[PDB]
Structure formats: structure tokens, C-alpha cells
Scaffold this active site. Structure first.
Site, mmCIF file in Angstrom:
data_model
loop_
_atom_site.group_PDB
_atom_site.id
_atom_site.type_symbol
_atom_site.label_atom_id
_atom_site.label_comp_id
_atom_site.label_asym_id
_atom_site.label_seq_id
_atom_site.Cartn_x
_atom_site.Cartn_y
_atom_site.Cartn_z
ATOM 1 N N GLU A 1 -9.453 -0.045 -4.870
ATOM 2 C CA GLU A 1 -10.779 -0.623 -4.694
ATOM 3 C C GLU A 1 -11.665 0.230 -3.800
ATOM 4 O O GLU A 1 -12.869 0.030 -3.749
ATOM 5 C CB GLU A 1 -10.670 -2.051 -4.140
ATOM 6 C CG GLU A 1 -10.000 -3.045 -5.109
ATOM 7 C CD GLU A 1 -9.100 -4.102 -4.425
ATOM 8 O OE1 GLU A 1 -8.954 -4.111 -3.176
ATOM 9 O OE2 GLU A 1 -8.522 -4.935 -5.160
ATOM 10 N N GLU B 1 14.298 1.209 -4.654
ATOM 11 C CA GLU B 1 14.112 0.906 -3.240
ATOM 12 C C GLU B 1 15.292 1.381 -2.408
ATOM 13 O O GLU B 1 15.297 1.263 -1.186
ATOM 14 C CB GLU B 1 13.807 -0.587 -3.021
ATOM 15 C CG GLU B 1 14.996 -1.507 -2.743
ATOM 16 C CD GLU B 1 14.581 -2.836 -2.085
ATOM 17 O OE1 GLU B 1 13.472 -3.336 -2.366
ATOM 18 O OE2 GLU B 1 15.361 -3.382 -1.272
#
Lengths: 299, 299
Positions: free
Chosen positions: A85, A116
Site C-alpha cells: 500500500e 518456516e
């Protein structure tokens, strides 16, 4: 391999949810909502460390470094989602804030096996973007124990880079490595171990603060106006002209007539409207002041 | 032209942040925190419409329908976010919940010129996935007037599918086109028009409710335990054991061997152990009660 999730708030059972499979459609959502109330409270305890985080990011921004996010699954996904954004909102380089997720692009839409746990992969992901001393790594994971994120913070630390952890369990190992430890304590999730819920809301909230506040400090907006918006559709093409009018109480289409007397750049437009300068002279005023409209407008 | 913007709340200025750029760094993030506090309260007023939507979605699911989210920008990415966690959390299919973003996949990391203004495409995108009347469409846009989403909702209505609108402005066109309108009124954003903030937070909590409530009602948990977890990493693997032990009080050793036998299905493993059946008979007795671990076992 683990076997001591027991000591973690994030793996703990929520008392007020033990018969959630038995409760009603409205009981369940009300509960979740009642639990959501706790999230802004837990961010509130964290604010001074968050303030300091922001101020050091501006510093780095200013030496030309970048804000780099890392995380697995949800945390990773939310890092990309804040990073995405920042250009259309603040007008900056797409490189200025980059979100990195373990497992590369596919991980955006779906999990990757052991992504992970892959301590080697983070070292390559960070090396591929030329991660350097001028940069800031924000490591993100609710458990505070994700090996990928842990190894990421370490390499960053080893290059002398500023490091921040955002975890949900206090006194975690990511917290120990980093220079600024942000600790989102939200309590047990409605679904035991569902960090996508409260912890991923806290994470969004901080990230948002981190980019929104730093960008403010860099004069990437005027008053509370989004003067550097990229207008890439009807809504923002309109908000553009709306923003020029809001800053300078201007009649009306002069707002329009200044916008393309440059390019849709509300900041430039209001600069050459208020300071009554030519487009080129309004610009160079702003250049000397790093784009801070308040400084270039003087006083 | 399209303003109109003066009307909407999402486009209004926030009096509590007029001099936000001339404020302390602690003062900015504290402003943000204060506004974040307002978000769960906004959700509280949507609790009856939200529960309405959950029930409806539990039914399309039970009728073999899919939950389908649409939006551009931040709303879109949040839709991809919510959907991406359903398979690993609740063990369902990648098709049961799908996020679709305007611009398509290229929009996942950055904006795309005018994708939210596309009447077509939303047609295309909603046909590549063969959206039928059995499917549920959730239109997400804070403004309440995004073209892509409205067009998307119109095509789903004029087709007979259930439609839900999440927006932040009252009496929005989207809200009118829709059957269930969820309206998250979150007030002005600190940065005028940066709906990636409260509205983005409000939209994360709604979508989390829709899916998390649904899957609980459909049996995707036992008590507040996340059975149906997929053990992707070392963390969820250990947690799987934790689930079987918390639900049966059965010691580390057995739980492991049972899970090793039940292919890391904690729901099956919990079933085989307490009912002393085998994987074959536990697997069949469970579909007899539609995977609802509390019916099958007891009943």
C-alpha cells in the site's frame, strides 16, 4: 523438536471458548468480537517501543536504507500487504518497503512445507535483495520462535543492521536477538493456536503504524491529507482534486487546472497554488526540502 | 465528476488529526491506537448481520457451495489472506474458500491501473472459477461504490447466488444490491482516505468471523481445539500431539503413535483412541456424523 508449546500463551486454551463447537452462530461471533477488543489494548502497552521503532526507521530511510519485513504464513502475508500500500498511498519507491515471505511468491496464496523451519532459505532471500547495514529488518511471528525469522534477524544483526521483533509471547528468542522488541500480548486465541486471529490483527495494526507514522515524518502528506497519492482509478483521480481544494480553499477547477499543469501531484499543485510560484519554481522549492510541504511552504 | 466523495465517511477528514504531521512520534502512533480502539465497537453493531451471513454460508457449504470473496487493492489482498488460512487451519479444500482480487495475482503485491473500475473482468474472473448460484459472493469495498465489486455483486444476484456486502459507508449501492449488508462504520481515517487502516482492520475481523464461525459450526474443531490442523512445520507437528493429549489425556507416547498411524490426523487420532476403534472404523463412524467429533463419539 519442540514439546514446550505449553509455556507459550499462543498455544494456550481460552477458557471462555471450551464449548465453542457447542455455542450458537451469534454466541461465537460476539465472543470473537469480545476478544477483538483486547487487541487494541495490547498494542497500547507497546506504543513507546513502537514510537522508537518508527523514529529509527526514518533515520534509516534517510541514510537511504529500506524497511524490510519477514514472516511465515500469516505474518509474512501481512508484511507484503502493508508493503503493497505504501507506493499508491505515499508516492514512494516500490523498493522503499518490501515484504518478504518464507517460501517465496507461492507462499502468498498457500503454505509451503517447512518454509518456516528453513534457516538456509532466509539467508538467500535476504541476500537476493542485497540486504545491507543501512536497512531495517522487522521480524514477525506470534510465537517468537520461528527458526526462519530467528535466522533472519541474526544475519541482519551480523551486518550491523537495525532489528525489530514483533511477537505475541513475551521473553521470546526473537525478542532477545532484536534491538527493539515489540510484544503483542493478546491472550489465548478463540481457537487454540490460531495466530491468524488476534495476533495477526495486532501485527497488521503495528505494521500500519510503522509505515504510516514514518511516512508522515518524511512529509509524505500535508496536514491529514494524502497529498502524494497515486491516482490510478476514478476514486483517487477525484480525491486528487478534492485534496488540492482541501489544502488551499480553492475555487474549484483551478484545483483541476494546476493538477495537469504538472502531473497529478497534489503536493506540487498546492505548492504552486499557495506559494503562487511557477511549476518549475514550486518544484525546486520542494527539492531543497526533501518534499516536506510544510518546510518548503516556510513557517 | 465522481464526487460524491464529500458525502462518504471514508473520504472525510478526522478532526483529531489535523496537525498530525506537526505532532510527536509518540503522539502519532497513540492517535492511531485510539482510533483502532473504535474498530471492535463498530463490529459490535454488525453482529446480527454478521451472524445472519454465517448461517447462510454454513448452508451453501452444506449444499456443496463455495465462499467467494472479491475486492481490489487492500480489500482484495485481505480476501486472499482469509482464504489462504482455511486449508491449513480447518483441513478443508482450497476450493471451499477462494479470494479473488481485481487485476488478478499481479495485484497481490502492487496496484493495477483502474482494475477496481472494470465492469468486465469481474465477469471474466467470476467465470474462470465457474461461480454458480450455489456459491456465495462477498463483495468488499470500504467506499461502498467500487465498480468491480458492484458489477460482481450484480452478476451474482442476477444469477440467484447469496450476496454479502462489507462496506464502511451507510446506504451504499453495494449494500442495496445485496441481501445481507454488513456495514462497518469506522469513522474518518487519520490519513484522509487511507482505508487500509480501520476499514482494513474492520474487514479482517469480519472475514475472520465468517470463516472461523462457519468451520466451527461445520465440525472443523473439537471444543476449542484445532483438530483438522495440517502439520506443515515443526510447530504444528508438536501441536498435533498437544491436541490429541488435551482431548484424551493420553500421554505423549500413545498420542504420537496414534497420529503416526492416523497420518497426522488429530481428529481421527482422537476418535480411534477414546472409542478404541481402528482407523478404518473411526474414519467411517466420523462421516456418519459428518466429521462432527462430538456427535460421532457420544451421540
Amino acid at each position: 523438536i519442540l514439546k514446550s508449546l505449553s509455556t507459550l500463551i499462543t498455544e494456550q486454551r481460552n477458557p471462555n471458548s471450551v464449548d465453542i463447537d457447542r455455542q450458537s452462530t451469534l454466541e461465537i461471533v460476539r465472543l470473537m468480537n469480545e476478544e477483538d477488543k483486547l487487541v487494541p489494548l495490547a498494542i497500547e502497552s507497546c506504543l513507546p517501543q513502537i514510537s522508537l521503532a518508527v523514529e529509527q526507521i526514518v533515520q534509516a530511510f534517510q541514510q537511504g536504507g529500506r524497511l524490510i519485513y519477514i514472516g511465515a504464513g500469516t505474518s509474512g502475508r501481512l508484511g507484503v500487504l502493508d508493503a503493497s500500500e505504501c507506493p499508491p498511498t505515499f508516492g514512494v519507491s516500490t523498493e522503499m518497503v518490501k515484504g518478504i515471505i518464507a517460501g517465496g511468491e507461492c507462499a502468498i496464496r498457500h503454505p509451503v512445507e517447512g518454509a518456516e523451519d528453513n534457516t538456509k532459505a532466509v539467508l538467500n532471500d535476504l541476500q537476493s535483495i542485497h540486504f545491507s547495514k543501512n536497512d531495517v529488518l522487522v521480524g514477525i511471528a506470534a510465537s517468537g520462535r520461528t527458526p526462519y525469522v530467528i535466522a533472519g534477524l541474526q544475519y541482519a544483526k551480523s551486518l550491523g543492521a537495525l532489528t525489530i521483533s514483533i511477537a505475541s509471547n513475551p521473553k521470546s528468542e526473537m525478542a532477545e536477538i532484536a534491538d527493539i522488541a515489540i510484544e503483542t500480548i493478546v491472550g489465548p486465541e478463540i481457537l487454540t493456536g490460531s495466530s491468524r486471529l488476534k495476533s495477526g490483527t495486532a501485527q497488521k495494526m503495528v505494521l500500519n503504524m510503522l509505515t504510516t507514522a514514518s511516512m508522515i515524518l518524511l512529509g509524505k502528506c500535508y496536514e491529514n491529507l494524502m497529498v502524494d497519492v497515486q491516482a490510478s482509478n476514478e476514486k483517487l483521480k477525484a480525491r486528487a482534486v478534492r485534496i488540492v481544494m482541501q489544502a488551499t480553499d480553492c475555487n474549484k477547477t483551478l484545483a483541476e487546472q494546476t493538477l495537469l499543469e504538472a502531473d497529478q501531484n497534489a503536493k506540487l499543485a498546492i505548492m504552486m497554488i499557495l506559494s503562487t510560484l511557477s511549476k518549475s519554481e514550486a518544484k525546486v522549492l520542494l527539492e531543497r526540502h526533501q518534499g516536506k510541504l510544510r518546510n518548503a511552504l516556510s513557517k
